[PDB]
Amino acid sequence: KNKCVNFNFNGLKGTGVLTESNKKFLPFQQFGRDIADTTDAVRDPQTL
Amino acid sequence: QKLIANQFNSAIGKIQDSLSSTASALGKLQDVVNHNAQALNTLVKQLS
Amino acid sequence: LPVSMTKTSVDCTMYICGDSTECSNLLLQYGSFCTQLKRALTGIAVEQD
Ligand SMILES: *[C@@H]1O[C@H](CO)[C@@H](O)[C@H](O)[C@H]1NC(C)=O
Numbered sequence: 001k002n003k004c005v006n007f008n009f010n011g012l013k014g015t016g017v018l019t020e021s022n023k024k025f026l027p028f029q030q031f032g033r034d035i036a037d038t039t040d041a042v043r044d045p046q047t048l
Numbered sequence: 049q050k051l052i053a054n055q056f057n058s059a060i061g062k063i064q065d066s067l068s069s070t071a072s073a074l075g076k077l078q079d080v081v082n083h084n085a086q087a088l089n090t091l092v093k094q095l096s
Numbered sequence: 097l098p099v100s101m102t103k104t105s106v107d108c109t110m111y112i113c114g115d116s117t118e119c120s121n122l123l124l125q126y127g128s129f130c131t132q133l134k135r136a137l138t139g140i141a142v143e144q145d
Pocket residue numbers: 046047
Protein backbone atom coordinates (compact mmCIF):
# COMPACT_ATOMS: atom_id res chain seq x y z
CA LYS A 1 0.00 0.00 0.00
CA ASN A 2 1.02 3.61 -0.67
CA LYS A 3 3.60 2.47 -3.24
CA CYS A 4 3.56 2.15 -7.02
CA VAL A 5 3.33 -1.61 -7.60
CA ASN A 6 2.32 -3.89 -10.46
CA PHE A 7 -0.97 -5.42 -9.28
CA ASN A 8 -2.97 -8.37 -10.64
CA PHE A 9 -6.37 -7.88 -9.00
CA ASN A 10 -8.86 -10.65 -9.82
CA GLY A 11 -7.39 -10.88 -13.31
CA LEU A 12 -7.06 -7.09 -13.64
CA LYS A 13 -3.46 -6.10 -14.37
CA GLY A 14 -2.14 -2.58 -13.96
CA THR A 15 0.28 -0.26 -12.21
CA GLY A 16 -0.55 2.40 -9.65
CA VAL A 17 -0.79 3.39 -6.00
CA LEU A 18 -3.20 1.49 -3.74
CA THR A 19 -4.80 3.64 -1.04
CA GLU A 20 -7.72 3.20 1.33
CA SER A 21 -10.93 4.31 -0.37
CA ASN A 22 -13.21 7.01 1.06
CA LYS A 23 -16.11 6.21 -1.31
CA LYS A 24 -18.79 3.87 0.03
CA PHE A 25 -19.52 1.06 -2.41
CA LEU A 26 -22.86 -0.62 -1.91
CA PRO A 27 -22.58 -4.25 -0.74
CA PHE A 28 -23.38 -5.64 -4.19
CA GLN A 29 -20.73 -3.51 -5.95
CA GLN A 30 -17.25 -4.95 -6.41
CA PHE A 31 -15.56 -2.79 -9.08
CA GLY A 32 -15.45 0.94 -9.86
CA ARG A 33 -14.95 2.86 -13.10
CA ASP A 34 -13.87 6.42 -13.84
CA ILE A 35 -14.42 8.44 -17.01
CA ALA A 36 -13.35 6.72 -20.24
CA ASP A 37 -13.85 3.26 -18.68
CA THR A 38 -10.79 3.66 -16.45
CA THR A 39 -10.57 1.49 -13.33
CA ASP A 40 -10.57 3.88 -10.36
CA ALA A 41 -11.30 1.54 -7.43
CA VAL A 42 -11.64 -2.16 -6.69
CA ARG A 43 -12.35 -4.33 -3.66
CA ASP A 44 -10.02 -7.04 -2.40
CA PRO A 45 -11.27 -10.56 -3.29
CA GLN A 46 -9.55 -11.92 -0.16
CA THR A 47 -10.69 -9.26 2.34
CA LEU A 48 -13.45 -7.33 0.48
CA GLN B 49 -18.75 70.12 -20.84
CA LYS B 50 -20.93 69.28 -17.83
CA LEU B 51 -23.59 67.63 -20.00
CA ILE B 52 -20.98 65.55 -21.83
CA ALA B 53 -19.37 64.45 -18.55
CA ASN B 54 -22.75 63.48 -17.09
CA GLN B 55 -23.64 61.56 -20.25
CA PHE B 56 -20.32 59.70 -20.15
CA ASN B 57 -20.77 58.78 -16.48
CA SER B 58 -24.35 57.61 -17.07
CA ALA B 59 -23.23 55.55 -20.07
CA ILE B 60 -20.50 53.86 -18.03
CA GLY B 61 -23.05 53.09 -15.31
CA LYS B 62 -25.42 51.63 -17.89
CA ILE B 63 -22.56 49.51 -19.27
CA GLN B 64 -21.73 48.06 -15.86
CA ASP B 65 -25.41 47.43 -15.13
CA SER B 66 -25.90 45.66 -18.47
CA LEU B 67 -22.79 43.54 -17.92
CA SER B 68 -23.99 42.53 -14.45
CA SER B 69 -27.54 41.76 -15.60
CA THR B 70 -26.70 40.04 -18.90
CA ALA B 71 -24.95 36.76 -18.11
CA SER B 72 -24.82 35.84 -21.82
CA ALA B 73 -22.99 39.03 -22.86
CA LEU B 74 -19.61 37.27 -22.55
CA GLY B 75 -20.78 34.22 -24.50
CA LYS B 76 -18.26 34.92 -27.26
CA LEU B 77 -15.45 34.53 -24.70
CA GLN B 78 -16.94 31.52 -22.91
CA ASP B 79 -17.23 29.88 -26.34
CA VAL B 80 -13.50 29.21 -26.76
CA VAL B 81 -13.23 27.69 -23.28
CA ASN B 82 -16.31 25.56 -23.98
CA HIS B 83 -14.83 24.24 -27.23
CA ASN B 84 -11.49 23.48 -25.58
CA ALA B 85 -13.09 21.65 -22.65
CA GLN B 86 -15.46 19.70 -24.89
CA ALA B 87 -12.65 18.69 -27.25
CA LEU B 88 -10.56 17.50 -24.31
CA ASN B 89 -13.50 15.53 -22.89
CA THR B 90 -14.19 13.95 -26.28
CA LEU B 91 -10.53 12.98 -26.63
CA VAL B 92 -10.72 11.38 -23.18
CA LYS B 93 -13.93 9.56 -24.12
CA GLN B 94 -12.32 8.05 -27.23
CA LEU B 95 -10.14 5.83 -25.03
CA SER B 96 -13.21 3.83 -23.97
CA LEU C 97 -12.75 39.58 -28.71
CA PRO C 98 -10.90 36.37 -27.75
CA VAL C 99 -7.12 36.62 -27.64
CA SER C 100 -5.73 33.22 -26.57
CA MET C 101 -6.57 29.56 -25.98
CA THR C 102 -5.66 27.09 -23.25
CA LYS C 103 -2.07 25.90 -23.65
CA THR C 104 -2.46 22.12 -23.87
CA SER C 105 0.30 19.50 -23.82
CA VAL C 106 -0.36 15.81 -24.48
CA ASP C 107 1.83 12.91 -23.34
CA CYS C 108 0.91 10.69 -26.26
CA THR C 109 2.63 7.56 -24.95
CA MET C 110 0.61 7.65 -21.72
CA TYR C 111 -2.61 8.33 -23.64
CA ILE C 112 -2.09 5.53 -26.17
CA CYS C 113 -0.49 2.87 -23.96
CA GLY C 114 -0.91 4.06 -20.38
CA ASP C 115 1.16 1.83 -18.11
CA SER C 116 1.69 -0.92 -20.72
CA THR C 117 5.41 -1.23 -21.44
CA GLU C 118 4.95 -3.61 -24.39
CA CYS C 119 2.55 -1.17 -26.06
CA SER C 120 5.09 1.63 -25.59
CA ASN C 121 7.78 -0.56 -27.15
CA LEU C 122 5.48 -1.27 -30.10
CA LEU C 123 4.58 2.42 -30.40
CA LEU C 124 8.23 3.23 -31.13
CA GLN C 125 7.78 1.29 -34.39
CA TYR C 126 5.41 3.88 -35.88
CA GLY C 127 8.02 6.62 -36.40
CA SER C 128 7.74 10.27 -35.38
CA PHE C 129 3.99 10.53 -34.71
CA CYS C 130 4.89 11.68 -31.20
CA THR C 131 7.28 14.39 -32.35
CA GLN C 132 4.97 16.10 -34.85
CA LEU C 133 2.02 16.27 -32.46
CA LYS C 134 4.18 17.53 -29.59
CA ARG C 135 5.78 20.15 -31.85
CA ALA C 136 2.36 21.34 -33.02
CA LEU C 137 1.13 21.66 -29.43
CA THR C 138 4.26 23.56 -28.37
CA GLY C 139 3.88 25.84 -31.38
CA ILE C 140 0.27 26.54 -30.39
CA ALA C 141 1.32 27.35 -26.82
CA VAL C 142 4.01 29.79 -27.96
CA GLU C 143 1.35 31.06 -30.37
CA GLN C 144 -1.00 31.95 -27.51
CA ASP C 145 1.81 33.62 -25.57
C1 LIG D 1 -9.23 -17.50 3.16
O1 LIG D 1 -8.75 -18.82 3.40
C2 LIG D 1 -7.88 -18.92 4.54
C3 LIG D 1 -7.40 -20.36 4.59
O2 LIG D 1 -8.48 -21.27 4.49
C4 LIG D 1 -8.61 -18.49 5.80
O3 LIG D 1 -7.71 -18.52 6.90
C5 LIG D 1 -9.18 -17.09 5.63
O4 LIG D 1 -9.98 -16.75 6.76
C6 LIG D 1 -10.03 -17.01 4.37
N1 LIG D 1 -10.52 -15.66 4.16
C7 LIG D 1 -11.78 -15.38 3.81
C8 LIG D 1 -12.10 -13.92 3.64
O5 LIG D 1 -12.61 -16.25 3.64
